[PDB]
Design a protein around this motif. Structure first.
Motif, PDB file in Angstrom:
ATOM      1  N   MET A 140       0.817  -1.194   0.000  1.00  0.00           N
ATOM      2  CA  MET A 140       0.000   0.000   0.000  1.00  0.00           C
ATOM      3  C   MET A 140       0.860   1.258   0.000  1.00  0.00           C
ATOM      4  SD  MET A 140      -2.555  -1.520  -0.361  1.00  0.00           S
ATOM      5  CE  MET A 140      -3.712  -0.166  -0.314  1.00  0.00           C
ATOM      6  N   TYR A 144       1.019   3.859  -2.937  1.00  0.00           N
ATOM      7  CA  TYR A 144       0.712   5.269  -2.733  1.00  0.00           C
ATOM      8  C   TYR A 144       1.736   6.156  -3.416  1.00  0.00           C
ATOM      9  CZ  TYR A 144      -1.372   9.230  -0.238  1.00  0.00           C
ATOM     10  OH  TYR A 144      -2.023  10.398   0.085  1.00  0.00           O
ATOM     11  N   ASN A 147       0.625   6.504  -6.799  1.00  0.00           N
ATOM     12  CA  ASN A 147      -0.410   7.514  -6.840  1.00  0.00           C
ATOM     13  C   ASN A 147       0.205   8.893  -6.802  1.00  0.00           C
ATOM     14  OD1 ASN A 147      -1.845   5.154  -6.523  1.00  0.00           O
ATOM     15  ND2 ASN A 147      -2.120   5.468  -4.330  1.00  0.00           N
ATOM     16  N   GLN A 153      -2.634   2.052  -9.410  1.00  0.00           N
ATOM     17  CA  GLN A 153      -2.130   0.947  -8.622  1.00  0.00           C
ATOM     18  C   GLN A 153      -2.078  -0.346  -9.413  1.00  0.00           C
ATOM     19  OE1 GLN A 153      -4.795   1.143  -5.338  1.00  0.00           O
ATOM     20  NE2 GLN A 153      -3.855   3.014  -4.537  1.00  0.00           N
TER      21      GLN A 153
ATOM     22  N   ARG B  92      -7.719   3.924  14.372  1.00  0.00           N
ATOM     23  CA  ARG B  92      -8.685   2.871  14.120  1.00  0.00           C
ATOM     24  C   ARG B  92      -7.972   1.537  14.062  1.00  0.00           C
ATOM     25  NH1 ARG B  92     -10.831   5.242  16.128  1.00  0.00           N
ATOM     26  NH2 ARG B  92     -12.617   6.651  15.822  1.00  0.00           N
ATOM     27  N   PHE B  94      -8.839  -1.637  11.182  1.00  0.00           N
ATOM     28  CA  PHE B  94      -9.681  -2.342  10.228  1.00  0.00           C
ATOM     29  C   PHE B  94      -8.779  -3.109   9.278  1.00  0.00           C
ATOM     30  CE2 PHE B  94     -12.241   1.303  11.484  1.00  0.00           C
ATOM     31  CZ  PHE B  94     -13.427   0.692  11.849  1.00  0.00           C
ATOM     32  N   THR B  96      -7.773  -4.330   5.195  1.00  0.00           N
ATOM     33  CA  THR B  96      -7.690  -3.729   3.876  1.00  0.00           C
ATOM     34  C   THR B  96      -8.002  -4.768   2.807  1.00  0.00           C
ATOM     35  OG1 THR B  96      -6.374  -2.306   2.429  1.00  0.00           O
ATOM     36  CG2 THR B  96      -5.261  -4.169   3.432  1.00  0.00           C
ATOM     37  N   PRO B 109      -8.924   1.533  -6.396  1.00  0.00           N
ATOM     38  CA  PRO B 109      -9.927   2.551  -6.049  1.00  0.00           C
ATOM     39  C   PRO B 109      -9.781   3.969  -6.582  1.00  0.00           C
ATOM     40  CG  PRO B 109      -8.378   2.097  -4.220  1.00  0.00           C
ATOM     41  CD  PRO B 109      -8.098   1.096  -5.256  1.00  0.00           C
ATOM     42  N   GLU B 111      -6.675   5.846  -5.299  1.00  0.00           N
ATOM     43  CA  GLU B 111      -5.239   6.044  -5.408  1.00  0.00           C
ATOM     44  C   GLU B 111      -4.752   7.246  -4.611  1.00  0.00           C
ATOM     45  OE1 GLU B 111      -5.267   5.477  -9.575  1.00  0.00           O
ATOM     46  OE2 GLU B 111      -5.491   3.311  -9.248  1.00  0.00           O
ATOM     47  N   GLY B 112      -4.531   7.033  -3.312  1.00  0.00           N
ATOM     48  CA  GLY B 112      -5.248   7.688  -2.241  1.00  0.00           C
ATOM     49  C   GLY B 112      -5.672   6.617  -1.249  1.00  0.00           C
ATOM     50  N   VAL B 113      -4.716   5.739  -0.904  1.00  0.00           N
ATOM     51  CA  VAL B 113      -4.860   4.333  -0.507  1.00  0.00           C
ATOM     52  C   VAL B 113      -5.739   4.046   0.704  1.00  0.00           C
ATOM     53  CG1 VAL B 113      -2.606   3.687  -1.471  1.00  0.00           C
ATOM     54  CG2 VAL B 113      -2.815   4.364   0.948  1.00  0.00           C
ATOM     55  N   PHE B 114      -5.937   2.735   0.937  1.00  0.00           N
ATOM     56  CA  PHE B 114      -6.864   2.051   1.841  1.00  0.00           C
ATOM     57  C   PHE B 114      -8.341   2.145   1.479  1.00  0.00           C
ATOM     58  CE2 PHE B 114      -9.258   1.540   5.857  1.00  0.00           C
ATOM     59  CZ  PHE B 114      -8.973   0.212   6.030  1.00  0.00           C
ATOM     60  N   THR B 124     -12.179   4.696   2.442  1.00  0.00           N
ATOM     61  CA  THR B 124     -11.866   5.875   3.253  1.00  0.00           C
ATOM     62  C   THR B 124     -10.607   6.590   2.781  1.00  0.00           C
ATOM     63  OG1 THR B 124     -10.688   4.543   4.889  1.00  0.00           O
ATOM     64  CG2 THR B 124     -13.009   5.051   5.319  1.00  0.00           C
ATOM     65  N   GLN B 125     -10.420   7.774   3.350  1.00  0.00           N
ATOM     66  CA  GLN B 125      -9.411   8.736   2.943  1.00  0.00           C
ATOM     67  C   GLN B 125      -8.048   8.346   3.496  1.00  0.00           C
ATOM     68  OE1 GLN B 125      -9.404  11.273   0.887  1.00  0.00           O
ATOM     69  NE2 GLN B 125     -11.511  10.792   0.310  1.00  0.00           N
ATOM     70  N   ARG B 126      -7.120   9.287   3.475  1.00  0.00           N
ATOM     71  CA  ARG B 126      -5.809   9.015   4.021  1.00  0.00           C
ATOM     72  C   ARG B 126      -5.825   9.168   5.537  1.00  0.00           C
ATOM     73  NH1 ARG B 126      -1.803  11.138   7.035  1.00  0.00           N
ATOM     74  NH2 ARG B 126      -1.796  13.178   6.012  1.00  0.00           N
ATOM     75  N   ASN B 127      -6.522  10.180   6.056  1.00  0.00           N
ATOM     76  CA  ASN B 127      -6.214  10.605   7.417  1.00  0.00           C
ATOM     77  C   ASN B 127      -7.431  10.704   8.337  1.00  0.00           C
ATOM     78  OD1 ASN B 127      -4.492  11.374   9.450  1.00  0.00           O
ATOM     79  ND2 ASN B 127      -3.690  13.165   8.384  1.00  0.00           N
ATOM     80  N   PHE B 128      -8.642  10.446   7.851  1.00  0.00           N
ATOM     81  CA  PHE B 128      -9.805  10.349   8.724  1.00  0.00           C
ATOM     82  C   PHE B 128     -10.675   9.165   8.312  1.00  0.00           C
ATOM     83  CE2 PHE B 128     -14.016  11.439  10.404  1.00  0.00           C
ATOM     84  CZ  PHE B 128     -13.699  11.754  11.708  1.00  0.00           C
ATOM     85  N   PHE B 129     -11.425   8.628   9.272  1.00  0.00           N
ATOM     86  CA  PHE B 129     -12.412   7.586   9.009  1.00  0.00           C
ATOM     87  C   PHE B 129     -13.511   8.210   8.162  1.00  0.00           C
ATOM     88  CE2 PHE B 129     -16.228   5.120  10.117  1.00  0.00           C
ATOM     89  CZ  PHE B 129     -15.770   3.824  10.034  1.00  0.00           C
TER      90      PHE B 129
ATOM     91  N   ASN C 390      -3.253  -6.402   6.897  1.00  0.00           N
ATOM     92  CA  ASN C 390      -4.550  -5.779   6.706  1.00  0.00           C
ATOM     93  C   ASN C 390      -4.855  -4.797   7.813  1.00  0.00           C
ATOM     94  OD1 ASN C 390      -4.976  -8.997   5.818  1.00  0.00           O
ATOM     95  ND2 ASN C 390      -5.442  -7.412   4.302  1.00  0.00           N
ATOM     96  N   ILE C 392      -4.845  -1.847   9.979  1.00  0.00           N
ATOM     97  CA  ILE C 392      -4.560  -0.489   9.531  1.00  0.00           C
ATOM     98  C   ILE C 392      -5.285   0.482  10.453  1.00  0.00           C
ATOM     99  CG2 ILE C 392      -5.229   1.190   7.713  1.00  0.00           C
ATOM    100  CD1 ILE C 392      -4.184  -0.832   5.649  1.00  0.00           C
ATOM    101  N   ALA C 393      -4.566   1.489  10.944  1.00  0.00           N
ATOM    102  CA  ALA C 393      -5.166   2.578  11.704  1.00  0.00           C
ATOM    103  C   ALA C 393      -5.328   3.822  10.838  1.00  0.00           C
ATOM    104  CB  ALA C 393      -4.311   2.921  12.921  1.00  0.00           C
ATOM    105  N   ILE C 394      -6.357   4.611  11.133  1.00  0.00           N
ATOM    106  CA  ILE C 394      -6.550   5.935  10.553  1.00  0.00           C
ATOM    107  C   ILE C 394      -6.964   6.867  11.684  1.00  0.00           C
ATOM    108  CG2 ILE C 394      -7.779   7.310   8.904  1.00  0.00           C
ATOM    109  CD1 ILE C 394      -8.378   4.948   7.299  1.00  0.00           C
ATOM    110  N   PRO C 395      -6.343   8.039  11.838  1.00  0.00           N
ATOM    111  CA  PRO C 395      -6.673   8.899  12.979  1.00  0.00           C
ATOM    112  C   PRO C 395      -8.041   9.537  12.841  1.00  0.00           C
ATOM    113  CG  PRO C 395      -4.450   9.320  12.195  1.00  0.00           C
ATOM    114  CD  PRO C 395      -5.145   8.519  11.140  1.00  0.00           C
ATOM    115  N   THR C 396      -8.670   9.783  13.987  1.00  0.00           N
ATOM    116  CA  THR C 396      -9.930  10.498  14.049  1.00  0.00           C
ATOM    117  C   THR C 396      -9.910  11.671  15.017  1.00  0.00           C
ATOM    118  OG1 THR C 396     -10.768   8.860  15.637  1.00  0.00           O
ATOM    119  CG2 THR C 396     -11.332   8.539  13.307  1.00  0.00           C
TER     120      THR C 396
END
Lengths: 317, 156, 420, 48
Positions: A140, A144, A147, A153, B92, B94, B96, B109, B111-114, B124-129, C390, C392-396
């Motif tokens: 990933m 990226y 990207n 990708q 978070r 989750f 992938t 997706p 390109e702008g991963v996850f 979802t985005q890079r930096n927020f859910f 798989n 994976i964390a993303i901040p909130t």
């Protein structure tokens, strides 16, 4: 340096006041700037990680890029190649008055910082910096980078193992291009060489007379009597001071050059390493897919994953 | 006070020589400071062009987060910046899935991963859910489903 | 640094070095009287083109006929000094004895040839000792004439130093061996005209040149001095045969040569000597040095110090405490501890600790201080991690850490009245 | 610059050490660095 010691000559320095104090002020601040160089270049991440030693990620092995903990040292193998490659032309105890003082940042810890960045850059998220890491699995990550190089990708996953070989043999071709090889290492060689040149020059300046009867202390004080003493001693001290002061001047200039490059060094440990430095012909000479650090004597060697597209179609528009 | 013509001036010239080397040293070191200070000054102008006239998207360049804004303020002989950074802080967990393998074809997706394979719900985005209903523009026709790692069905 | 309130950190201060203790003088047991009172009081003093030469070998040179005499016409040391004369032990100083008229003393120097010192006895331009002169008009210059001694005044040109021809050449200006009285054919012999009532510039000056062959061996001729005993592993004083200085002695490891004495290892600093009584001893003159640099926590918390030494092994250093050998001789000062690794050395006043804070004051090589302790270093915020795929964390949530940044965009705009 | 033709000025210049050597070296490397700069700025082109 001036005034190895006899008796007279300390008073004869203090005839010129605080000059020893100025010199040591200068060189001390210089040394502190080198410490700063090692910090701001190097101490860029608090959140140090474990060397994870999975050493295979999809297909992508960091063989000898990382250190390998079953070795005695925790150095990477390439660092050690670099150590043996670079020539160097109990206590280190001269009496030339000179000292190559050891750093703050110990060479293992140098390697530990660099290798930690290798790990947490190979692991631990493209997001790297503000935060710590976000558990991102390196396909990933350089997906990226695709990207951020302007493509999809598809180019990653449909070329995956191909890419592996395209990278990994390349690494080994790195291990080609670094093992028996040649002066594509030149700038750190230049640094150490100029250090030796200035420094050995400074030593020979102690061997240099400045018109006096001798070119050495206390052999003058074999055959002098009186003011003649301080005549030739003052000639010596002013000449040695001019030499030493030209030295201090040039060291300071070296510090200026070296810190412009060090600003670059932390800059490429930031922009090239921690994310994609989207500026062009900056990191390597391609498009900067990645780049890695490498510790080195007195310096650093960066490892630039470019991306060089070379075939031709011809299609109408 | 005890000056003759000649030898007194020789002593005077000793003083002139010392004061002159010292002053010339001061000059030279000032000029060194000028070079250092002007490299930094060019940096300051550079940052006030980037950080202050906009958002310098190159990362950890203005601010040691991700540089949202910046603010200059004057000072004696220098200047002080206030870096409006961006330091994210939460987590978070989750899974992938780099594709959306729905009908036997792969979907890389945006390109702008996850892709959010949090039970394959969204993307979802890079930096927020930041979830996205998987549709015609969350991805594209991306080959077929062969080198995928994840499979996401029921794309309707 | 001129403040009561001084902040925290290693701040530089002055040097430290170790005072020597012993006085090692190593001369051979050569014990003799020089032919000084033989040469300067001889019955024979020749002319200048027939200048006498004497080697002086294996003596104890007192220099005590020298200082207590008002007889001397020119008691003058040119490249050397009269008072520091028996400070070194010599190998074969060379007397050059001759009878001049009363004006050749000015005509004897490095330079100052004229005709007499260039047609009778040629001088060098590098090594000098002392010239000594006197008059002997009361015995040699007889007022009836003393035409016995001569000089030469006809030759094809100049000379190289220390070189002599007895040959009475009946000179002609292109070779041509003549018999005088032929034309341009003379002999160079010329009497001295030495009368008792002769002029002051006509006086018979019996004059000795002293060349000082300066130490081309382990030498011979010492002065009236006192050879002492050896010490190893301790900073002492020196005065060897042609050497002085201050250093730390140990035996050598050479393939040392029979003609040999010195080692000059990196460049010109002698670094190994052969003792004059058959020992092979390295001379590591760096007794110990470096500069003190005070650890202090800032005087809003303390006055508890620690003195960081630099080029030190912390072994002669506890000695330099308890033999009082540190040149910053401290009054209220003990030996609480001695932390020593990280080869920058002696840290009197902190402790080995593994508890690694953020490295407040960086010490020497990797060691740092806190509170007062001096541990090594925390490398940073350590993390054990296992980057699986798989997961994976993303901040909130986040922050806006507005930081300072400080960029000096000018220096003080200065100027100098160089006219004032 | 310092004495063009001489006997003595060359001798006393030898008596002041390796000054001239450093100066030649420094300005030469200056020259060399500007030529480096001339490569570095300009000569980026693969194929003219």
């Amino acid at each position: 340096y001036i005034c190895g010691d006899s008796t007279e000559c300390a008073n004869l320095l203090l005839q010129y006041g605080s000059f020893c104090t100025q010199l040591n002020r200068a060189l001390s601040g210089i040394a502190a700037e080198q410490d700063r160089n090692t910090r701001e270049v190097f101490a860029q991440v608090k959140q140090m990680y474990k060397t994870p030693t999975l050493k295979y990620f999809g297909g992508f092995n960091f063989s000898q890029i990382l250190p390998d903990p079953l070795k005695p040292t925790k150095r990477s193998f390439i660092e050690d190649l670099l150590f043996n490659k670079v020539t160097l032309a109990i206590c280190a105890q001269k009496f030339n008055g000179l000292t190559v003082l050891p750093p703050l940042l110990t060479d293992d810890m140098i390697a530990a910082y660099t290798a930690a960045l290798v790990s947490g850059t190979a692991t631990a998220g493209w997001t790297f910096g503000a935060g710590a890491a976000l558990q991102i699995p390196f396909a990933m990550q350089m997906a990226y980078r695709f990207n951020g190089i302007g493509v999809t990708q598809n180019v990653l996953y449909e070329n995956q193992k191909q890419i592996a070989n395209q990278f990994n043999k390349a690494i080994s071709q790195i291990q080609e291009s670094l093992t028996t090889t040649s002066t594509a290492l030149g700038k750190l060689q230049d640094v150490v060489n100029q250090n030796a040149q200035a420094l050995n020059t400074l030593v020979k300046q102690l061997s240099s007379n400045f018109g006096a009867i001798s070119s050495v202390l206390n052999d003058i004080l074999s055959r002098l009597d009186k003011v003649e003493a301080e005549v030739q001693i003052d000639r010596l001290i002013t000449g040695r001071l001019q030499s030493l002061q030209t030295y201090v001047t040039q060291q300071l200039i070296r510090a200026a050059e070296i810190r412009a490059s060090a600003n670059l060094a932390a800059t490429k440990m930031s922009e090239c390493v921690l994310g994609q430095s989207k500026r062009v012909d900056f990191c390597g000479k391609g498009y900067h897919l990645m780049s890695f650090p490498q510790a080195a004597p007195h310096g650093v060697v960066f490892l630039h994953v470019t991306y060089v597209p070379s075939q031709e179609r011809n299609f109408t528009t | 006070s005890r000056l003759d013509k000649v030898e007194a001036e020789v002593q005077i010239d000793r003083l002139i020589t010392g004061r002159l080397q010292s002053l010339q040293t001061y000059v030279t070191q000032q000029l060194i400071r000028a070079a250092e200070i002007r490299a930094s000054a060019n940096l300051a102008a550079t940052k006030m062009s980037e950080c202050v006239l906009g958002q310098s998207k190159r990362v950890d360049f203005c601010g040691k987060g991700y540089h949202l804004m910046s603010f200059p303020q004057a000072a004696p002989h220098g200047v002080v910046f206030l870096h409006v950074t961006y330091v994210p802080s939460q987590e978070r967990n989750f899974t992938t899935a780099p594709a959306i393998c729905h009908e036997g074809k792969a979907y890389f997706p945006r390109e702008g991963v996850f892709v959010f394979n949090g039970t394959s719900w969204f993307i979802t985005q890079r930096n927020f859910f930041s979830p996205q209903i998987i549709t015609t523009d969350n991805t594209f026709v991306s080959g077929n489903c062969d080198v995928v790692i994840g499979i996401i069905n029921n794309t309707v | 640094v001129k403040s009561f309130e001084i902040d925290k950190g290693i701040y530089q201060t002055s040097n430290f070095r170790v005072v020597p203790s012993g006085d090692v003088v190593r001369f051979p047991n050569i014990t003799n009287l020089c032919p000084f009172g033989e040469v300067f009081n001889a019955t024979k003093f020749p002319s200048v083109y027939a200048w006498e030469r004497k080697k002086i070998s294996n003596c104890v040179a007192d220099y005590s006929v020298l200082y207590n005499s008002t007889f001397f016409s020119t008691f003058k040391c040119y490249g050397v000094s009269a008072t520091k004369l028996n400070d070194l032990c010599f190998s074969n100083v060379y007397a050059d004895s001759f009878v001049v008229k009363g004006d050749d003393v000015r005509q004897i120097a490095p330079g100052q040839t004229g005709v007499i010192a260039d047609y009778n006895y040629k001088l060098p331009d590098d090594f000098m000792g002392c010239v000594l002169a006197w008059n002997t008009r009361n015995i040699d210059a007889t007022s009836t004439g003393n035409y016995n001694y001569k000089y030469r005044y006809l030759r094809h040109g100049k000379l190289r130093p220390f070189e002599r021809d007895i040959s009475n050449v009946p000179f002609s200006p292109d070779g041509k061996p003549c018999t005088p009285p032929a034309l341009n054919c003379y002999w160079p012999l010329n009497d001295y005209g030495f009368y008792t009532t002769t002029g002051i510039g006509y006086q018979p000056y019996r004059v000795v040149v002293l060349s000082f062959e300066l130490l081309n061996a382990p030498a011979t001729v010492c002065g009236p001095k006192l050879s002492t005993d050896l010490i190893k592993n301790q900073c002492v004083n020196f005065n060897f045969n042609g050497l002085t200085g201050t250093g730390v002695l140990t035996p050598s490891s050479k393939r040392f040569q029979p003609f040999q004495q010195f080692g000059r290892d990196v460049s010109d600093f002698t670094d190994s000597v052969r003792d004059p009584k058959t020992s092979e001893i390295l001379d590591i003159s760096p007794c110990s040095f470096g500069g003190v640099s005070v650890i202090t926590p800032g005087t809003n918390a303390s006055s508890e110090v620690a003195v960081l030494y630099q080029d030190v092994n912390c072994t002669d250093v506890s000695t330099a405490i308890h033999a009082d050998q540190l040149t910053p001789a401290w009054r209220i000062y003990s030996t609480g501890n001695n932390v020593f690794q990280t080869q920058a050395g002696c840290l009197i006043g902190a402790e080995h600790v593994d508890t690694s804070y953020e490295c407040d004051i960086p010490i020497g090589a990797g060691i740092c201080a806190s509170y007062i302790v001096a541990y090594t270093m925390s490398l940073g915020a350590d993390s054990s991690i296992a980057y699986s795929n798989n997961t994976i964390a993303i901040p909130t949530n986040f922050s806006i850490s507005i930081t300072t940044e400080v960029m000096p965009v000018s220096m003080a705009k200065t100027s100098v009245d160089c006219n004032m």
